Amino acid sequence: ARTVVLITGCSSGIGLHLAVRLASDPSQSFKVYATLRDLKTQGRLWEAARALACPPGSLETLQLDVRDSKSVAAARERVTEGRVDVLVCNAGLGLLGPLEALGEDAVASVLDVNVVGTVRMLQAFLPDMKRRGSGRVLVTGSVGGLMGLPFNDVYCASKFALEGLCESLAVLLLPFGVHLSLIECGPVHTVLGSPEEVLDRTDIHTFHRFYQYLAHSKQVFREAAQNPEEVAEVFLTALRAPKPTLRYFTTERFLPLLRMRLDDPSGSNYVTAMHREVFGDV
Amino acid sequence: ARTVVLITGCSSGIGLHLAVRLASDPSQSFKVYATLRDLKTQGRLWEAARALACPPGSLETLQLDVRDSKSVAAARERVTEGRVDVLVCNAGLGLLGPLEALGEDAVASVLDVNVVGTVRMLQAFLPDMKRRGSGRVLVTGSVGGLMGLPFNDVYCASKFALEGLCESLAVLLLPFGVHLSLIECGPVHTVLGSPEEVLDRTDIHTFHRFYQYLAHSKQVFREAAQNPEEVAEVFLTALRAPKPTLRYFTTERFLPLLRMRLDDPSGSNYVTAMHREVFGDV
Numbered sequence A, B: 001a002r003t004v005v006l007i008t009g010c011s012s013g014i015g016l017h018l019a020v021r022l023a024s025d026p027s028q029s030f031k032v033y034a035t036l037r038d039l040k041t042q043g044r045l046w047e048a049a050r051a052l053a054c055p056p057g058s059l060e061t062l063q064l065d066v067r068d069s070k071s072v073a074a075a076r077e078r079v080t081e082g083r084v085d086v087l088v089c090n091a092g093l094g095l096l097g098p099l100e101a102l103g104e105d106a107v108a109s110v111l112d113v114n115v116v117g118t119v120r121m122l123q124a125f126l127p128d129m130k131r132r133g134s135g136r137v138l139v140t141g142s143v144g145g146l147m148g149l150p151f152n153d154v155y156c157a158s159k160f161a162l163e164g165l166c167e168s169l170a171v172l173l174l175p176f177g178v179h180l181s182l183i184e185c186g187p188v189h190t191v192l193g194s195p196e197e198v199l200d201r202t203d204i205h206t207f208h209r210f211y212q213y214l215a216h217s218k219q220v221f222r223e224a225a226q227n228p229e230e231v232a233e234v235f236l237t238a239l240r241a242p243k244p245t246l247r248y249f250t251t252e253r254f255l256p257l258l259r260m261r262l263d264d265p266s267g268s269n270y271v272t273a274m275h276r277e278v279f280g281d282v
């Protein structure tokens, strides 16, 4: 179809749902290049596509490893239409655990995939959009890019990094007609490490707090996780907005914590509120 | 002396000033390990130390490359007191230019030094502080970690990343008696790329906007840059606070732009205001 969409990280989760949502759109106006790091994981995407009866040719899979600029360049060459109307930077990795228990390689990988990988995509696709004077870039954000969460230090670092990157670009892009938007997701229905391993790399008190955090997050997920269909639709709302805003929120549930965070720049109200919220009183 | 301070990136700028400010303190209560990536750049630090008459033994230089965990481990071993009371994570790199004109290596380096290097330091020193139930960690922040600036995409990405990292850690650290604070700096009196090189890697319109930005920043610096002595003193105010806050601001000048940014979560007021502020009307 006519609007060419390229999405990264479509093997599961939001990327998978978004790819099939667009490819199966009743208007048949989207051509979707769903990219994955490893093609051997494409089965779920095709099963979903078949379930939604995506018309033949509305969806194509490409292997694209955001850690490698050559892979990024090669996938761009595979876009037969010679243009990308909507670029969805969704590829992302999580990392949970006490900071001192995280391997340096794992820390570097999260940043390389989440942040540098997004930079690689923008460097490869943005020039063309600037030239044409049109294009939409949607970036999967997280409420973790808006406020710090204990035991998610590196993940939050990476999501905050995207906020800074995108906001900086948005200020420049205004006159180019290229729109960039972050879709700020809360928990969505869709890694960890052996207790033994974690305990071996941290102290007993940190380990105890980790347990409390895990218990707390499990509850937040139960109460607040959204269906992927609801979240994917927010991407569509952003891509159809004639004048998209910088951020779209999939839920308003965290806006108050965000405001408290915003109203006390010293950060002490937020730190204290979040600490009592997750652990209790200290 | 008694309070052991370890500071990264002391070859120039804030780190250099802070190191000599602490080592020369009239109380003679600080022992400072000033670290540098390359010892051949230590001359300015020693000239400054001599000018301030730092008592012999109040300052020692160590080579510490934050990109290398072995180097981090080796510097930690050189701390003869066997403890670090105050850790100042200051090492930082800047990167200015149109995103598409930045080399992938330069982008990765900024993140590795600014973000992963800080993680390496925390992983190496935080466990000890948690064990003792005391310690202060000061991290050099920037107003660029609080709001996006055009042409500073990667730099802002890295400073925003520190905000997320530190805020996440602060929530956990509250009960450990380990204090973490970001010192949010505006311009301070203390890299770029050939016009030809930049033009070769971007379009003429982006290049034009880059010129406008450079003109604008030159003016902001002239009007708002603070003396390094004033900025270094903010670190001291934070390190002496009995109950330090998460953030200290060296200036209040940008607080309004920060508030506008905070009051419109969609980001459109900020993007528009910043765009007119730097370029004009579009």
Ligand SMILES: C[C@]12CC[C@@H]3c4ccc(O)cc4CC[C@H]3[C@@H]1CC[C@@H]2O
Pocket: A142, A143, A144, A149, A185, A186, A187, A188, A216, A217, A220, A277, A278
């Ligand atoms: C950061 C996430 C959204 C915010 C969630 C949250 C939000 C608030 C809170 O008090 C705890 C948690 C735990 C899990 C978090 C989620 C894990 C993945 C998701 O992106």
Ligand SMILES: C[C@]12CC[C@@H]3c4ccc(O)cc4CC[C@H]3[C@@H]1CC[C@@H]2O
Pocket: B142, B143, B144, B149, B185, B186, B187, B188, B216, B217, B220, B277, B278
């Ligand atoms: C980001 C910095 C502080 C904020 C400064 C600013 C702040 C506001 C603004 O409109 C423009 C600039 C240009 C230079 C920026 C500085 C460059 C180094 C410093 O950390």
